[PDB]
Amino acid sequence: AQAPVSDRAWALFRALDGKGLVPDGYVEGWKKTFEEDFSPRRGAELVARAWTDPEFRQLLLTDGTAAVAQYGYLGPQGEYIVAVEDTPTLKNVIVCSLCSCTAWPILGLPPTWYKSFEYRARVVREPRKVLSEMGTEIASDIEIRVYDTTAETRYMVLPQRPAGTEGWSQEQLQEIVTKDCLIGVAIPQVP
Amino acid sequence: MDGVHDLAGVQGFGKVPHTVNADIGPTFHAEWEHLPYSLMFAGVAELGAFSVDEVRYVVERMEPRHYMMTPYYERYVIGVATLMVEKGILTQDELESLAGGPFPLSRPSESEGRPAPVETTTFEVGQRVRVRDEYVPGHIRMPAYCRGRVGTISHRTTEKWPFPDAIGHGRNDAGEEPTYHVKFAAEELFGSDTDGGSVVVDLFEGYLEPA
Ligand SMILES: [Fe+3]
Ligand SMILES: [Mg+2]
Ligand SMILES: [Mg+2]
Ligand SMILES: [Mg+2]
């Protein structure tokens, strides 16, 4: 038997706050960071830059941390970054089978589905079927590689740039790089 | 710890509750949901009461049925509360008084953890390694599907971190080690019963040995 979760969560807050252990505006500040600053729009920016700037692409793939630092997007759960490059014969997908490990600052906090037991159990073993069920068909002539986020590396996928986007601006490209593209379960689509 | 949290490879689950690019709603679906992470950071960064590794472990320590029936953010409310009680900062009495009802916590640890190993090997990209065939009852960042399996190094980190099996129990002997991206063939991990290509696990040096 358990008290409502809202009551338990606020009880934890109140117990700590009432002992002076929580600075003024502390949880409010974190809420703002989580809701407004940590965003897949940042990862999209990185991808769009890599797509249009061969030099930056090279930096992003060889020293992800330095590349992300240039944009000022290192942060909690995103201090050591590795970007993994999709190719015509390789599709990368990220999971945290043991919990929910995610590059928060550049992908945003993980969505419910990514933290689900279903995704955590299945994508490591049957990524092709999982992606297919989610709406992404990966042909058999393509290697699927699943990165399980088990330590401190925090990953982003650099997806392939779709045909039909030649000449687009970085802002235009950013729009088609979604959260799901950064996690690796979706391929960018030309609207 | 060979707990129910070690889910990779478990069979019988249904569909992932998402189709690509579907609306996931707001970051927080209830007004309390930012609390577990924020209070984790209060504990780690402001109070120095515990490490992030200790938070992963205390969640692993939820009674197994409790773990399996509890939504994500709730597990971290339970985990952070448990640590606060274990560290002598809060009492369960006061949590239940403020909550107005039962606030069951994670189970006590059954292991004191283990130190970072003194004997490890620096590996290089392209080298073949085996995951040490070891069983650790406390916290460990090795999912069971790779125990005793052989793969190839694709990255050695340029930074080092405390050994989770030590710092996840608040021990003083976690040292520091780099981790390695170890690439396994899907068939090395799941035989014929997989549709994948490769799986890359980010493994602490102390979990590895020359193949
Ligand atoms: Fe995780
Ligand atoms: Mg082109
Ligand atoms: Mg134009
Ligand atoms: Mg197991």
Side-chain angles (χ1 to χ4, degrees):
Chain A
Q2 301 179 103
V5 62
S6 177
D7 292 338
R8 286 181 280 129
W10 287 109
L12 178 60
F13 175 80
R14 296 199 309 264
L16 292 167
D17 187 54
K19 297 180 193 292
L21 302 175
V22 183
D24 272 356
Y26 193 79
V27 311
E28 298 92 343
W30 272 114
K31 186 173 166 79
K32 190 173 173 306
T33 295
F34 295 144
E35 291 185 332
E36 304 182 4
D37 293 330
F38 294 173
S39 172
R41 301 337 299 153
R42 288 168 160 192
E45 191 176 7
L46 293 166
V47 169
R49 173 75 179 283
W51 279 347
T52 58
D53 182 345
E55 293 173 51
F56 188 80
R57 178 185 186 102
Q58 175 75 350
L59 181 62
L60 180 67
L61 295 177
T62 59
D63 192 344
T65 305
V68 176
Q70 289 188 176
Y71 276 82
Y73 300 155
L74 300 180
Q77 294 300 300
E79 293 185 271
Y80 190 89
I81 303 301
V82 169
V84 296
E85 177 196 25
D86 286 354
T87 75
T89 64
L90 176 72
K91 179 80 197 80
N92 303 283
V93 185
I94 305 161
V95 64
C96 176
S97 70
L98 297 169
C99 50
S100 67
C101 314
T102 290
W104 292 349
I106 54 169
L107 267 60
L109 296 190
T112 295
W113 68 261
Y114 175 95
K115 303 174 284 197
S116 72
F117 299 163
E118 285 81 3
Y119 188 69
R120 289 178 47 203
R122 295 179 60 212
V123 79
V124 177
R125 185 164 188 168
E126 51 168 331
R128 203 168 315 261
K129 181 170 181 188
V130 170
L131 264 62
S132 177
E133 292 173 355
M134 298 179 66
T136 300
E137 289 300 314
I138 305 295
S140 283
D141 67 290
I142 298 175
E143 177 181 355
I144 299 175
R145 178 170 296 156
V146 178
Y147 283 82
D148 196 351
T149 308
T150 49
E152 300 293 353
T153 308
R154 293 285 175 277
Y155 294 104
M156 55 170 282
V157 177
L158 180 58
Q160 291 193 283
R161 181 176 177 174
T165 66
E166 296 84 0
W168 284 20
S169 64
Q170 289 187 38
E171 203 77 54
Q172 288 166 339
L173 291 164
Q174 288 171 18
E175 301 185 337
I176 70 172
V177 184
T178 64
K179 190 180 182 78
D180 285 351
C181 292
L182 294 166
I183 295 168
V185 298
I187 288 159
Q189 304 300 324
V190 177
Chain B
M1 179 178 182
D2 279 344
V4 294
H5 77 276
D6 189 356
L7 285 166
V10 173
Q11 295 176 307
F13 286 102
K15 289 199 203 298
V16 174
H18 182 68
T19 58
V20 294
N21 297 148
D23 197 0
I24 56 171
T27 297
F28 299 118
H29 290 251
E31 296 300 309
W32 60 267
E33 288 183 348
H34 60 114
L35 293 175
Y37 284 174
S38 302
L39 298 173
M40 171 180 73
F41 287 118
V44 172
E46 299 299 311
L47 304 182
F50 49 78
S51 60
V52 175
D53 307 62
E54 282 176 279
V55 178
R56 296 196 177 90
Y57 183 48
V58 72
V59 169
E60 296 171 2
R61 289 190 280 122
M62 286 188 67
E63 193 276 337
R65 301 176 187 82
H66 197 196
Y67 183 103
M68 294 303 290
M69 67 174 294
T70 301
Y72 181 87
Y73 278 124
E74 184 176 341
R75 296 199 295 271
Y76 294 81
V77 167
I78 294 166
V80 173
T82 301
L83 284 168
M84 293 299 185
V85 174
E86 290 177 344
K87 301 298 190 191
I89 296 169
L90 299 182
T91 59
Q92 189 171 200
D93 175 72
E94 75 184 305
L95 290 169
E96 292 181 322
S97 296
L98 287 166
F103 199 149
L105 302 171
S106 297
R107 298 181 64 257
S109 178
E110 287 166 19
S111 171
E112 292 188 324
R114 63 177 185 162
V118 172
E119 304 192 37
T120 66
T121 298
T122 301
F123 305 98
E124 312 287 346
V125 175
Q127 183 161 2
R128 291 209 92 196
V129 295
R130 196 198 319 280
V131 180
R132 295 176 180 201
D133 189 14
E134 290 176 351
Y135 286 83
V136 174
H139 186 55
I140 188 174
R141 296 301 292 183
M142 177 213 61
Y145 68 80
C146 72
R147 189 191 284 107
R149 297 308 194 181
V150 178
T152 301
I153 306 297
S154 68
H155 188 252
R156 177 182 68 237
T157 57
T158 58
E159 299 298 337
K160 300 187 188 181
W161 296 272
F163 196 55
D165 314 30
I167 192 167
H169 295 251
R171 298 176 61 105
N172 64 14
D173 51 16
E176 68 174 9
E177 300 183 343
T179 70
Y180 296 82
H181 296 185
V182 185
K183 185 177 68 174
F184 300 90
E187 61 268 26
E188 171 68 4
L189 307 174
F190 304 114
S192 66
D193 193 23
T194 176
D195 68 19
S198 49
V199 177
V200 177
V201 192
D202 190 12
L203 292 162
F204 275 81
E205 188 166 284
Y207 301 152
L208 304 175
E209 61 189 22

